[PDB]
Write a protein that binds this ligand. Structure first.
Ligand SMILES: Nc1nc2c(ncn2[C@@H]2O[C@@H]3COP(=O)(O)O[C@H]4[C@@H](O)[C@H](n5cnc6c(=O)[nH]c(N)nc65)O[C@@H]4COP(=O)(O)O[C@H]3[C@H]2O)c(=O)[nH]1
Ligand SMILES: Nc1nc2c(ncn2[C@@H]2O[C@@H]3COP(=O)(O)O[C@H]4[C@@H](O)[C@H](n5cnc6c(=O)[nH]c(N)nc65)O[C@@H]4COP(=O)(O)O[C@H]3[C@H]2O)c(=O)[nH]1
Ligand SMILES: Nc1nc2c(ncn2[C@@H]2O[C@@H]3COP(=O)(O)O[C@H]4[C@@H](O)[C@H](n5cnc6c(=O)[nH]c(N)nc65)O[C@@H]4COP(=O)(O)O[C@H]3[C@H]2O)c(=O)[nH]1
Ligand SMILES: Nc1nc2c(ncn2[C@@H]2O[C@@H]3COP(=O)(O)O[C@H]4[C@@H](O)[C@H](n5cnc6c(=O)[nH]c(N)nc65)O[C@@H]4COP(=O)(O)O[C@H]3[C@H]2O)c(=O)[nH]1
Ligand SMILES: Nc1nc2c(ncn2[C@@H]2O[C@H](COP(=O)(O)OP(=O)(O)O)[C@@H](OP(=O)(O)OP(=O)(O)O)[C@H]2O)c(=O)[nH]1
Ligand SMILES: Nc1nc2c(ncn2[C@@H]2O[C@H](COP(=O)(O)OP(=O)(O)O)[C@@H](OP(=O)(O)OP(=O)(O)O)[C@H]2O)c(=O)[nH]1
Ligand SMILES: [Mg+2]
Ligand SMILES: [Mg+2]
Ligand SMILES: [Mg+2]
Ligand SMILES: [Mg+2]
Lengths: 439, 447
């Protein structure tokens, strides 16, 4: 993940760059507003860490200008404030900040925030891609406060009561049940007295029903060990006590919006028919699945290595099957054909349904010479045995034409590889039927 | 998660029980074979940790008998072996063990194995539920063999040995360059075996790069680690490797861990690509965009259980559109579908996002309102009726206008022994009485 760090003092920038690079992050740096705005639009980073106090262009202005640009509006921005930054955080939210860090930088809080917002960036990126080809803000959620400190829980619920729908639970047993219902966020007190909030959190993560339910832990800043333990158990992010209203607002909004993005992408859009990856008739994968996998396969082959082979199989005279036996028997033949095809090719290969009665087999780490002999093996297994249909009442023979291609070259592309296999099929169809042709 | 620990010596059992309970596990104990087999069938634990050497019935026999019983065959079994336990691991795999631990027990290795196998147990449980449902209602590769395994290592002698060990049951591929490996890992790869102690690249940096990209974020990864360097082991597990392999690589350990990761992946992919996209397991109505009855039932179960324990009740609204056939008759089925889409938008806009406006039937909708009393639920239904009936529905790309009315039945969960079925049955009565006494009305039924 790529992080942009912005601070007027070079020593602050180098210190953060060293810490983040040690944790396997790709870090760029800027030391004033104009350069940071130019870098963000040019490089399009994943997260921006931004100091609020800089000469000339303050961080608030940089944040506002990042949200004005439509190409950088989606990039999470973290504002680094000072100890007493209540006013800064208030103006930070108005400027459009995602969350906050306070200096001097606490390493646990630093990486906790980065890890949370990088995961959010992943769903942000995915949602934008699908939108290019439903409540999606972070407000109005049911937030479950699990805490035995009444004064604290009531204060948290009051702060959350204007933007969300808060609910308090002192008993952990009742909280487990409520947490299994329509709950958007759980705020648990790590420093609880009558129950182990960390044990409670671990119970949530063990059950599949609640394994991905967002959890925020209220932690004591003196006890660093409990902070690390909570993050290890699987808490999404932590809130230092006493609870800051602006930090509470930001962190809750991030978790609820991340949840809604994920559920919308997985429950609605993934189950839609335009984005499906498996053919319902044959049970094989479709072209959408194949294209994604073939992209990486061809890219690796172009760098020098074992090539990728492609088999395009087309059933000969499939109309006649539908005309003589009916469309339902035709569907029986396609299902039985798909079973035979997958059974006689490696599970590491990609036998997919390419067209209506056309199939594709992508064979990684395979050369053209072998692919031609493999196509011959496939043809003999599907054409050598008859297809029994109509609950055993009818027997039918089938023949197929195959076109074969392999990825040889530095600038080869998935489209060129398949276009070369198409020609194989068209030439195999022209010169009779039941043949293999390699181009 | 519930773990069963089996050892003949009590001190060994208490030591493991203490370590595991400290990590928030529910631990049961047995001190001989017969007792462990009886406990396993009765309690059905999630993981069994089993000593190989016990008087009378050894661990190997217990493992074999666990796999013979069809009710416990699915429970992963970990065998605790000795130092030179090559024979133990060979005989363990023959007995049907899932994986192994070596004594003296290493806490890092202990929790790595348990965490790995508990996640596998989750998918196992889900697959078995779906298979139970399919049996009541009346062909993919689900073993752990034959996978494409990507070995990312610059040590030639090690990589060649690993590839040879994997070359009999799987399809191994070696990659020295981490850049080329990053690309291959995004294709049809079932497992990545990376060398944490590499010389020309940081295998742990490589692993973190895999986890950062969405394409490869859940790709199973095994890390080959040095047992001397405890810090690197913990760091690899923190980065997100699925499990670790101690060097030099044990053939039986390599076989076990690879099978576990590959089978877990195939279970997950089958459950998410095939079965989740089927109509029996969907949770969102594709037409209206609301959730459906399957989703509602799951959520309502927890909601009612909490209400029965004493607290704010749960209310239920059943909305049925009046004279929907006439819409289909006059304007056609496609305009009818437009009305349903527009109705769902109005319904969701006029209830809280914490509420559950779902498509209950064909033209029947349900609104589950948690922490809500009957008196308020009745006034909310009145709000809904006025918003749907007060404004006409624009259909046919703006060319046609239509009026719609709805009948609503309202109920709330009052009582300790109330059930979701009774709650909805009381709302059904409301709807049926609202239909009988004219249309465009709301009727409430209290217990
Ligand atoms: N992606 C893909 N490539 C294929 C397939 N069939 C053959 N090839 C490629 O062609 C090479 C020669 O395979 P073979 O002549 O049939 O001679 C093979 C074959 O007789 C046998 N073999 C390997 N795997 C299998 C298998 O899964 N089933 C059977 N019956 N024999 C296998 O071992 C011989 C050597 O195999 P390899 O060294 O791996 O090298 C193989 C492989 O790279 C396939 O179905 N899918
Ligand atoms: N002539 C030839 N045919 C190939 C080859 N590779 C795959 N096939 C064909 O495709 C079938 C499925 O192989 P698989 O899916 O990888 O699933 C295979 C594979 O996982 C394993 N297997 C069999 N032989 C070998 C082998 O030589 N090396 C490895 N690594 N696995 C093998 O057993 C499974 C069942 O294999 P089969 O029953 O024989 O049935 C095989 C075989 O008919 C090949 O290289 N040459
Ligand atoms: N699950 C669910 N329950 C509902 C709904 N509408 C009303 N209630 C329940 O009935 C209580 C009274 O709501 P009200 O009479 O309109 O009197 C309300 C209302 O005037 C206002 N209010 C709260 N949230 C909203 C809102 O989202 N939009 C508007 N326009 N007013 C709201 O604050 C008053 C007190 O509300 P509450 O304290 O929360 O206590 C509410 C709430 O518990 C609903 O749509 N869904
Ligand atoms: N914590 C809190 N948030 C508030 C309040 N007032 C408005 N909001 C927030 O602002 C969103 C829009 O509410 P609305 O425009 O009045 O339009 C609302 C309103 O028309 C109706 N509604 C929801 N609750 C109530 C209620 O309690 N009383 C009445 N009369 N209507 C409600 O449903 C619409 C959607 O409400 P939501 O889905 O939850 O989405 C609401 C909610 O997130 C409040 O008093 N307390
Ligand atoms: N039973 C069945 N047949 C399929 C399916 N997909 C395509 N068909 C059909 O395959 C037939 C084409 O077969 P070929 O005759 O070999 O086509 P080709 O010239 O390109 O090689 C078309 O006949 P058709 O009579 O026009 O079929 P249809 O239009 O009624 O679906 C086409 O509609 C399918 O999923 N199930
Ligand atoms: N456009 C559309 N209409 C739906 C859908 N689901 C149900 N309908 C309607 O639900 C109706 C069932 O009758 P009710 O709606 O309960 O009786 P009512 O009109 O008095 O309230 C179906 O009657 P039907 O006319 O006999 O069935 P149909 O021929 O319209 O499909 C059907 O019109 C849907 O998904 N899309
Ligand atoms: Mg400054
Ligand atoms: Mg054809
Ligand atoms: Mg012993
Ligand atoms: Mg109706």
């Amino acid at each position: 993940a790529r992080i942009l760090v912005v601070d007027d003092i070079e020593a602050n920038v180098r210190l953060l760059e060293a810490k983040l690079t040690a944790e396997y992050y790709e870090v760029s740096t800027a030391m004033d507003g104009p350069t940071a705005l130019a870098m963000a639009a040019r490089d399009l980073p994943d997260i921006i860490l931004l100091d609020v106090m800089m000469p000339g262009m303050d961080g608030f202005t940089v944040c506002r200008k990042l949200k004005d640009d439509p190409t950088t509006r989606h990039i999470p921005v973290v504002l680094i404030t000072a100890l007493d930054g209540r006013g800064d955080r208030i103006q930070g939210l108005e400027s459009g900040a995602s969350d906050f860090l306070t200096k001097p930088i606490d390493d646990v809080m630093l990486f906790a925030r980065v890890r949370s917002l990088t995961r959010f960036k992943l769903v942000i990126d995915e949602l934008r891609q699908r939108e290019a080809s439903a409540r999606l803000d972070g407000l109005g959620g049911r937030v479950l406060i699990v805490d035995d400190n009444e004064r604290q829980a009531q204060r948290v619920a009051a702060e959350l009561g204007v933007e969300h729908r808060p609910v308090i639970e002192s008993d952990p047993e009742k909280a487990k049940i409520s947490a299994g219902g329509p709950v958007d966020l759980v705020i648990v007190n790590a420093a609880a007295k009558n129950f182990d909030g960390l044990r409670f959190t671990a119970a949530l993560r063990s059950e599949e029903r609640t394994r991905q339910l967002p959890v925020l832990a209220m932690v004591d800043p003196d006890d660093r060990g409990r902070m690390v333990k909570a993050l290890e158990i699987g808490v999404n992010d932590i809130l230092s006590r006493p609870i800051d209203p602006q930090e509470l607002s930001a962190r809750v909004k991030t978790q609820i919006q991340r949840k809604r993005y994920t559920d919308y992408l997985r429950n609605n859009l993934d189950h839609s028919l335009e984005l499906a990856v498996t053919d319902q008739l044959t049970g094989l994968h479709n072209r959408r699945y194949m294209t994604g996998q073939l992209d990486s396969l061809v890219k690796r082959a172009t760098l020098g290595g074992d090539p990728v082979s492609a088999l395009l199989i087309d059933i000969d005279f499939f109309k006649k099957i539908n005309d003589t036996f009916g469309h339902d028997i035709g569907d029986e033949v396609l299902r039985e054909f798909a079973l035979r095809l997958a059974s006689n090719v490696r599970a590491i290969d990609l036998p997919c349904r390419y067209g209506g009665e056309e199939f594709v087999v992508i064979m990684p780490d395979t050369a053209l010479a072998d692919a031609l002999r493999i196509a011959e093996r496939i043809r003999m297994h599907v054409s050598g045995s008859p297809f029994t249909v109509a609950h055993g009442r009818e027997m039918l023979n089938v023949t197929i034409s195959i076109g074969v291609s392999a990825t040889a070259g530095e600038g080869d592309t998935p489209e060129a590889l398949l276009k070369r296999a198409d020609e194989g099929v068209y030439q195999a169809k022209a010169s009779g039927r039941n043949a293999v042709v390699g181009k």
